């Protein structure tokens, strides 16, 4: 089997990408942000506290002849934002671009924190790291992805995210069409329940490309890059007026500027990112102060190859009995 779905950002500075996923019988389809870096399938629901619903698009499982109680589960999450969310749990039928999972857990949120009410666009979340970092209790949860894996045609999915524009998430199988030259697969560790691997180094602009190992993860549910102080102070350098600002709370630039490019290496092979993508524009409405894409890392404890890195490439997440990441420009 196979499937494949359209991913759409959320707003005009690609903040994040939503993905239609089908719940229940018969079908409720909710909007639902794909998340590389966690590993909960949880949505807004009839359960949620009416308070904390703002337009998003609820599951309600009592209208599902396929839903079930999971019995005593419970789940309660935190993100790297310091957003969260928490409630009990159903498995349900689930697909997504025409893959269908039976039984999968379906956490079904009966409270979620302020920047959630706030999305009205993302309707839950969909998590595609490893299912060691599932908060279900007291029976651990698989991801949409490792259920899928065994009736998949090949064991892995890719990320085809769009600058400004529409993308691509596909199951079980590698669109030959959808990169350019070769894809170049990378190790990866799954200590910490992440799609972390080592990148090679970087270039800022058209400068020469300082070779040193920088561990990070794949990260689809990051907005940003976020890498060592040393690397993004290197970059800010190269844009005339960027400083890095704590009331606003990272690296800003005039708006008057244009942004060098940032490249990364995956082995020998090189990523770039071109400049128009590091901008998130105006840090507030009417203000010649942009926010930039590249930030840095220095308190996170992790490096986070985020949604600024992943969509200037076509990503492969191979989910095989040792996994890799395969990267390919387009
Ligand atoms: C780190 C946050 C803190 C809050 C207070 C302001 N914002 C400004 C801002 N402006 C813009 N334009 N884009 C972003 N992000 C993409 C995160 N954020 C940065």
Request: proline share 4%.
């Amino acid at each position: 089997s196979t499937g494949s779905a359209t991913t759409t950002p959320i707003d005009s500075l690609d903040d994040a990408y939503i993905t239609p996923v089908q719940i229940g019988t018969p079908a409720q389809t909710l909007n639902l942000d794909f998340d590389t870096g966690s590993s909960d399938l949880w949505v807004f629901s009839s359960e949620t506290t009416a308070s904390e619903v703002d337009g998003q698009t609820i599951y309600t499982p009592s209208k599902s002849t396929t839903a079930k109680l999971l019995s005593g589960a419970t789940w309660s999450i935190s993100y790297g934002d310091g957003s969260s969310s928490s409630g009990d749990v159903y498995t349900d039928t689930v697909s997504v671009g025409g893959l269908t999972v039976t039984g999968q857990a379906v956490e079904s949120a009966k409270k979620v924190s302020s920047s959630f009410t706030e999305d009205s666009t993302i309707d839950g979340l969909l998590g595609l790291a490893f299912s060691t970092l599932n908060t279900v209790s007291p029976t651990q949860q698989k991801t949409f992805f490792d259920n899928a894996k065994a009736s998949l045609d090949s064991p892995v999915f890719t990320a085809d995210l769009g600058y400004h524009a529409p993308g691509t998430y596909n199951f079980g199988f590698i669109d030959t069409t959808a990169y350019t030259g070769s894809i170049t697969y990378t190790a990866v560790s799954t200590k910490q329940g992440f799609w972390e691997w080592t990148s090679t180094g970087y270039a800022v602009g058209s400068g020469t490309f300082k070779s040193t190992s920088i561990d990070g993860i794949a990260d689809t549910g990051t907005t940003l890059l976020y890498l060592p102080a040393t690397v993004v102070s290197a970059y800010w350098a190269q844009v005339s007026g960027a400083k890095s600002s704590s009331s606003v709370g990272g690296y800003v630039f005039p708006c008057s500027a244009t942004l060098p490019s940032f490249t990364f290496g995956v082995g020998s092979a090189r990523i770039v990112i071109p400049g128009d993508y590091i901008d998130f524009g105006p840090i507030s409405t009417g203000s010649s102060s942009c926010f930039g894409g590249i930030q840095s890392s220095a308190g996170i404890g992790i490096n986070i190859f985020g949604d600024v890195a992943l969509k200037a490439a076509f990503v492969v997440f191979n989910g095989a009995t040792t996994p890799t990441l395969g990267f390919a420009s387009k």
